[model samples]
Target: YTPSELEELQQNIKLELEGKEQELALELLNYLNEKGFLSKSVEEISDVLRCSVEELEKVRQKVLRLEPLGVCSKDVWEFLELQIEEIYPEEEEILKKALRDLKRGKKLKPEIKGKLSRLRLFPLSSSAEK
Candidate 1:
C-alpha cells in the first residue's frame, strides 16, 4: 500500500481502538500487517501500535496478524532501548542479552535464565544491497 493508504489505515485503526471497536481495529490491523505497514515482530508492531507486547498479542489474535516473527530489531526493541537509555541510565542487561541473541541467532535466553520466545529469528532477503 502507498504511504497515504497506510496513513488512512493507521488513523482508522486508532479511531476504532478509541471507540472500543476492537473487532474493526483488528481488521484494520490485518490489512496493515498484510501490506507491510505493520512489522512482523511483536516488539516492532508494539512500537507501531504504541502498546505493550501483551496488548499487541490481543490485537493480533483478533486480526490473525503479526509482522514476520523474528524481526526483532531496527524497530520496537531498538526504539525502546534508545528511548529508555536516554531517559534513565543504568546497565541495560536485558536489552543487551536480547541484542546479543539477535546478532548470534540465539534464542533470547532471559537475563535470569529460560528463553524468551523467538520472533522470525532470521534476516530479511532484500534488494537494499544493490
Candidate 2:
C-alpha cells in the first residue's frame, strides 16, 4: 500500500470512529499486518482483543471495502463468497451451490463444475493437498 493510500484509509477510520472504537480499529490493523490478508478469523481476533465476534464483525464491515476485498474473512469460503458477489453477481446462486459442494466434499454437476473452472474457483483444500 502506498503511504498516501494508507494515510487516507487511516483518516477515514478516524473520521468515522470515536475513542475506544478508533483504538480498536488501529489495533486490528496492526494485527492484520502481522498476519497476511484474510489470514485471521473473527473468533481469533475477538479472542485476542477481548471483544465479541459481533463487535469484531462490525469493525470488519467498516474496513472490508479496502483493498484485498475480503481482508477480514474467516476462511476461504467466506472470502470466495465475497468475491463471487462482485465478480458473478448474476450467477451467485449456482456458484454458491458449487461452493457448498466443495465444502461438503461432493461433486458438482458437470455444468456447474465447468462454470467453477471458468471462474478459476479452485478448492483451497485441494491446493493444500498438493
Candidate 3:
C-alpha cells in the first residue's frame, strides 16, 4: 500500500479512534483499495467483527472526518459532501443537493455555480458538473 500511504492512514486512524473501535478501524484498513476508497461491495470484515453494518457505518463516518478526510468514502459525491460539512455545516443543504444532482447535468443557480467552480480546486472539495 505504499502508493496509498497506508502507514500514514494507520497512524491517523490510530490517533483518531479509541480502544473498542480500533478493531473495526484496523479491519477497514486491511480492505481499503489503493485508490483509498472502500470497496463498493460489503466486505467479509462484517462477520469477523460481529458488528452491525450501522455500527461500522458510524465508525467509517468518524474515520472519514480525519485529516486528508474522506479517505474511504463510498463515492465522489459522498467525499465532496464530507468536506462541505466542515466548512458549511449548516448552510449546505440545497447547496449540497445542487452538487449531488450536478452530475446529471441539470442543476444549480449561477451563484452556487460560482462557489462550486471556486471550490473545484480541491480534490473531493469542489463541484464536478457534467
lDDT (CA) per prediction: 0.41, 0.57, 0.61
Off by over 4 Å in 2: 1-3, 34-38, 66-130
Total clashes in model 2, counting residue pairs 3 or more apart in sequence or in different chains: 0
Off-target runs (Cα >4 Å) in candidate 1 are 1-21, 33-96, 104-113, 117-130
lDDT of 1 by residue, 43-119 (tens): 66566656666665555443222222211223434433432343223645665566556655565455423222322
- Model 3 residue 117 lDDT score: 63
Query: What are the per-residue Cα lDDT tens digits for candidate 3 across 1-130?
Result: 1233446656787886677676676666556564555664434566665767777777766766665555565454565576568656775685687777775557578777876665432442333335
lDDT of 2: 0.57
Model 3 residue runs over 4 Å out of place are 1-9, 40-44, 94-130
For model 3, state the Cα shift of residue 93 in Å.
2.8
- Give the top-scoring candidate (lDDT): 3
Of candidates 2 and 1, the better by TM-score: 2
Candidate structures ordered by TM-score, highest first: 3, 2, 1
> Residue 13 deviation, candidate 1, in Å?
14
**lDDT score, residue 31, model 1?**
34
Where's the lowest-lDDT run of ten residues in candidate 1?
64-73
